[PDB]
């Protein structure tokens, strides 16, 4: 059945807060050629015990996880199921991603504006893979260029702003050149100094 | 160190804490929230339209949150009642696209380094609360096991109108007002 399936936590053998977390994490490289599952149990902020598919068994990361790791490794049916979760959870959900999330293409909005400092605002794009370059009369500028980190909007879009400190001349044209997987042709946008 | 891969997903960010008590069930793919499960209404709420085609049994969230409830009680007693350490959150405010007076925009408030995951993210327009135009994400995981959360405020841009993001947490001696000043805080 093609529905997302979850990784499962197992049972442990100014106000005050006590926090617990379980993360069923899947790592994919080269599609489903290389797949790794790392399930983590965290007490407050300390990871206490883990299942890494590259190890193939539970391992306490700290003292508080040793009772669980000892107990869960003694249960052969748990181990076999955990060893199979790379396919039933990671590889299974990856097949759903390939036709939905891994196909989301949002072309960026490229804008050039001052605040001399020239800012190329490359907003609302998906996926993250981007290349933004400045040019002054077809000459590539890098020495005087500073870029923000990649900015995660949260709504499944990214933005990034690339700034260029320039010495404005009369016969000068500044072009922001953006490359992104959702574009067949790279976007080139121009700015000309006026007064 | 961190694991190098092309893609990273959390096919279960499971959260349960004593305060409340509350829980959260989300799936994340490459750092973005795919859906959450409303534990009260027993309902899968998708954060991305293309995923609306799928199903996810809200009972999966409910059973896992109950496993985390037992594990929490178990580790509270095992740790000799060691409680979570309040972490000072880092607040950043920026717009979704370049600012145009006479062109609507969204103001984004990122609250980072959140721990424990109990936070109040309200918006102020010239000093007073805002209700309409507001929305927010769930608590999104970080590899250091703290969270972040992003809040939004859809607006009509004005030269007079000034906006602040008021964040409340136990790691702060008094709330935090982060003024939205468009003088390149993103570019430092």
């Amino acid at each position: 059945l093609p529905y997302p399936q979850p990784e499962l936590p197992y049972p442990q053998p100014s106000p005050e807060d006590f926090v617990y977390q379980f993360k069923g994490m899947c790592y994919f490289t080269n599609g489903t050629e290389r797949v790794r599952l790392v399930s983590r149990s965290i007490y407050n902020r300390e990871e206490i015990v883990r299942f890494d598919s590259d190890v193939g068994e539970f391992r306490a990361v700290t003292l508080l996880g040793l009772p669980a790791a000892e107990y869960w490794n003694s249960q052969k049916d748990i181990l076999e199921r955990k060893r199979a979760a790379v396919d039933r959870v990671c590889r299974h959900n990856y097949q759903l991603e390939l036709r939905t999330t891994l196909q989301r293409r949002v072309e960026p909005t490229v804008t050039i504006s001052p605040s001399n400092l020239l800012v190329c605002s490359v907003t609302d794009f998906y996926p993250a893979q981007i290349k933004v370059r400045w040019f002054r009369n077809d000459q590539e500028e890098t020495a005087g260029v500073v870029s923000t980190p990649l900015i995660r909007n949260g709504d499944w879009t990214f933005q990034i702003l690339v700034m260029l400190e320039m010495t404005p001349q009369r016969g000068d044209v500044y072009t922001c050149h953006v490359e992104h997987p959702s574009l067949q042709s790279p976007i080139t946008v121009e700015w000309r100094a006026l007064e | 160190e961190d694991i190098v891969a092309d893609h990273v997903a959390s096919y279960g960010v499971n959260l349960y804490q004593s305060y409340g008590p509350s829980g959260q069930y989300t799936h994340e793919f490459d750092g973005d929230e795919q859906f959450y499960v409303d534990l009260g209404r027993k309902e899968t709420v998708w954060s991305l339209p293309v995923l609306r085609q799928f199903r996810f049994d809200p009972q999966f969230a409910l059973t896992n949150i109950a496993v985390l409830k037992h594990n929490l009680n178990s580790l509270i007693k095992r740790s000799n009642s060691t409680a979570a350490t309040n972490e000072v959150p880092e607040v950043t405010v920026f717009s979704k696209s370049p600012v145009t007076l006479g062109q609507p925009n969204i103001l984004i408030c990122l609250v980072d380094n959140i721990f424990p995951p109990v936070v109040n993210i309200t918006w102020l327009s010239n000093g007073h609360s805002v209700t309409e135009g507001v929305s927010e994400t769930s608590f999104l995981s970080k590899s250091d096991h703290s969270f972040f959360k992003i809040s939004y405020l859809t607006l009509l841009p004005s030269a007079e109108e000034s906006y602040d993001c008021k964040v409340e947490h136990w790691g702060l001696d008094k709330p935090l007002l982060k003024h939205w000043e468009p003088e390149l805080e993103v570019l430092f």
Partner: antibody
Amino acid sequence: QVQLVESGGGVVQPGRSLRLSCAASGFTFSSSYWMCWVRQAPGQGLEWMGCVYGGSDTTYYASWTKGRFTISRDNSKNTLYLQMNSLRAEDTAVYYCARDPLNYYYYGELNLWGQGTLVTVSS
Amino acid sequence: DIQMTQSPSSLSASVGDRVTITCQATENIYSGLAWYQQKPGKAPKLLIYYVSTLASGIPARFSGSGSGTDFTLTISSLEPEDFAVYYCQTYHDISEVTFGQGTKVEIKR
């Protein structure tokens, strides 16, 4: 290798209580499946009564139960129990306990049932 | 409380006969279907889950099909060991799991 052995079945007076036992062997109660109770009246079919999660307090009962049944599993003894309250002639059935994946077939298909214990409601 | 309606309530067939059992849900149960066999004096045995997944060991002559409300169990070429009562089971809502009535497969002489 793995099995569920039931006990405590027999005769019971109408209006009185009865606790059935279901001891697990070859495995210990854990996540990824449900520990359930299914009764079957003579010559009739299967009727699901309720499940307890293999790894938590998550207990569900069929609508028709009306709070008469209590499903619990003591981990120290590795035993699943069925408390039956306010019994009537309608309750006469062979009572089975099962290890049922249910919404967890994706994680593991192990389907295991007890031998069944006979419960008779009559004075 | 998803109600399952199993048809027929009983049937008669000989060895080699293609046998079809049918189960009907009062609503869409989205692949949450299992099929059990029950022989006299024995607890049920799982045959198929997820509508059509043959449980391990179960012979290739057994098969499942269907979607939403209509589902079938097909024994391609019947064998003497196949005379027993079959049940469908819905686990789409794990808080209200229900079994279909039952279908006794009987020998024709």
